[PDB]
Amino acid sequence: KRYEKLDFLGEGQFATVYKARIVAIKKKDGINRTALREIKLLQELSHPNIIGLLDAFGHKSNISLVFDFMETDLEVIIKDNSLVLTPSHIKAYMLMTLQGLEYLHQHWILHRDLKPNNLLLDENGVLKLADFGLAKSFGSPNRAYTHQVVTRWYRAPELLFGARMYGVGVDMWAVGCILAELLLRVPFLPGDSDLDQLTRIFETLGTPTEEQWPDMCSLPDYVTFKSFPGIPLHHIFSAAGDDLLDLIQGLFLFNPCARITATQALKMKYFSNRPGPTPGCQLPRP
Amino acid sequence: MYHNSSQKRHWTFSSEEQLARLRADANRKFRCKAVANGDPVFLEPHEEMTLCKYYEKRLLEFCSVFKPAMPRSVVGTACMYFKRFYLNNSVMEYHPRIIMLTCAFLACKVDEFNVSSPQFVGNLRESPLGQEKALEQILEYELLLIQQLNFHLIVHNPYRPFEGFLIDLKTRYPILENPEILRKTADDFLNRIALTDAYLLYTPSQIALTAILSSASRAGITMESYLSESLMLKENRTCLSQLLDIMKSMRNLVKKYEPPRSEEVAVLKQKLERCHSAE
Amino acid sequence: ALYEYQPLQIETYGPHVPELEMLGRLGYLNHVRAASPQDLAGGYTSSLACHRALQDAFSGLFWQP
Ligand SMILES: CC(C)c1cnn2c(NCc3ccccc3)cc(N[C@H]3CCNC3)nc12
The missing domain is CATH 1.10.510.10 (Transferase(Phosphotransferase) domain 1)
Incomplete structure (x- = not known):
C-alpha cells in the first residue's frame, strides 16, 4: 500500500494499531461498525483537540483507518x-x-x-x-x-x-x-x-x-x-x-x-x- | 452540522451543468475502458439518468417496505448515497440493482439503525439462495460504495430542518396560526424535490424552507413576512433576493422533472442487462 | 498566560438561533414534546431537541455553492 509500516503499537479487542509512514493505522456482518462510526464522525469534525482522521482504506470487509500519530x-x-x-x-x-x-x-x-x-x-x-x-x-x-x-x-x-x-x-x-x-x-x-x-x-x-x-x-x-x-x-x-x-x-x-x-x-x-x-x-x- | 459538513463542502454543486458533466464523464470513461479492455450496447448519459431515476424509485420502494420500520433519515441517506455514487460512476460498470441495496445497507450502518445482515436480506422478495447471493454482492460492493463516496457518510437530510422551521413558525409567526396544516403538502413537495437533483444543488435548510413556502403558496398564503421580518431579511435585500431565486429555481427543477416511462425503461433495462452480460 | 474564555464562533450561514437557556422564555418549548422524568433524570431535556431542530433549520439557509 501507500503506507510503509514502522512498528506495532498495540492490540485490542476491536482492532490493532501500527505506526507507519508519521501516522497511526488502526486495522456476513460486513465492515465493522466501530470503524464506520469513527469514519462517519471524524470526517465531520475538525478541531485541534479532536483526533484527525487523515485517510481510510481497506479490502473486502476489512478496513484500516489512518490517524495522526500520538506520542x-x-x-x-x-x-x-x-x-x-x-x-x-x-x-x-x-x-x-x-x-x-x-x-x-x-x-x-x-x-x-x-x-x-x-x-x-x-x-x-x-x-x-x-x-x-x-x-x-x-x-x-x-x-x-x-x-x-x-x-x-x-x-x-x-x-x-x-x-x-x-x-x-x-x-x-x-x-x-x-x-x-x-x-x-x-x-x-x-x-x-x-x-x-x-x-x-x-x-x-x-x-x-x-x-x-x-x-x-x-x-x-x-x-x-x-x-x-x-x-x-x-x-x-x-x-x-x-x-x-x-x-x-x-x-x-x-x-x-x-x-x-x-x-x-x-x-x-x-x-x-x-x-x-x-x-x-x-x-x-x- | 451542515454549515461545516462534507455534504456542503464536496456534495453541493453549482448547477445542473456540473452534474451533467460528471455523469457524461463517467459514461465516457466507462466507454473508453470497455473499448480498451474488449455500438448499440452502450448507453448515453440521458439513458443512464433514466435508469438511475428508475432505480432510485426502486430503492425508495425497498426502504418503504423494509422490516423493521426503517427510519426516514436512513432512507434519505441511502438515496443520497445512490445519487452521489452515480454522479461519478456508470450504471454500465456497477449495476444499480446491487448498488442501491448496498446504499441501503451502508445507510443502515451509518445512521446507527442496527439490523443484522440476514434480517436485511430477508426483506428482499427472493428465494434464500437469492438472498445469500445478494448478501455476498452487497458485502463485495460495500467498500467500493464507501470509497466512491470519498468516505463522506453523514448525510444531512431536510427533515430535521423542516421540523425546526415548523417550531420557528409556531413560535415567532402568529400570522400563520397553525403551521401544522403546512406539513403534508410540504412533505409531498419534499418528496418531489427528492426525485430531482436538488439534494446535490441546495442546502437541506433551503430545501425544507422551499417545501414549506410552496405548501403555503399552494394553500393560498403569501407568508413573505416570515422571511422579511422574522428571518431579519428586511435589512438585507441581497440575502432576500438570493434566497427567493433559490426557491424559485428549486420549484422550476421540480416543474421540469419527468418520471421515467414504462416501456422506455424496459428497453433500457434490456440494454443494461446486455451490457452486464457481454462484459 | 492566563486563559480567557473566547467563545468559538462557527459561521452557520443562516438566521440567529436563540440560545439554549432562552428557549423556554421565548415560547419555543411550547411546541416540542415534553421530556419525561426518566429523560430528565439522565440529563435529557426537551430544550436540547428544540435547540438542535432550530439549529438544523437555520444552518446554511443563506449559503450558495
Ligand atoms: C488515534 C489512535 C489510532 C492512535 C494514535 N496514536 N496511537 C498510539 N501511539 C503510541 C502510544 C500512544 C499512547 C500511549 C502509548 C503509546 C497508540 C495507540 N494504541 C496503543 C495505546 C493504547 N492501546 C494500544 N493508538 C494510537
Missing part, C-alpha cells in the same frame, strides 16, 4: 510516578479536554468513552480526544442509547442507573473522574461491578436525595442505597484550591442537568485564575 496518553502520565502533575499541568490537560469536548458537544456528539488512555498527547503537547468508536450524536428524542457506555470507573451515576437518554453529563462526569485521577494519581472510584461503582460513588460523595436529583427514582436500574454522608471534597483533594473545588463539585453534581457543561466549565474562575495553564510544549512527557 502518549493521559493514562501513561497518571501512572508515571516520575512525573509530577503540577496545578498548571492539570489545568492545561483539563483545558484542552474541555475545549475538545465543547467543540464536540456543539456539533451534538457525545464521546461516551472518556478516560485517560482515550486522551492522547501529540509531540507538541496537544491533547486530542480519540477512540470515537462509542461516540454518538445526541439531541434527538426518537433515538435510544445503551447504558453500557463509558468504562465503569468513569461511568456516571445516571448511566449506572440505566439511563437510556442522556446528554453531555456522561462526558462531564468522566471528565470529573479524569480530573480526580489527575489529582490523586489513582483511579478515583475503582468499582469491581456496577453495584460496587455506585457504592464507591455514594461513599465518596454522599447518597443523593431528591433535593440533589429530582427524578433519580425514575431511572430503570435505580436501587435505594444507604444514606452515606460522603467525604468533604477538601479532604479528598487536600491540595485543591477553592476554584478547583468548585470545578470538581460542578463536574461531580449528581443531577446531570445541574452538572456543568463544557462551556460552563470553561467559564469557571479556575481556568481564568492564576496560575495559567502550561503551554503544550512544556507539558510533562515520559
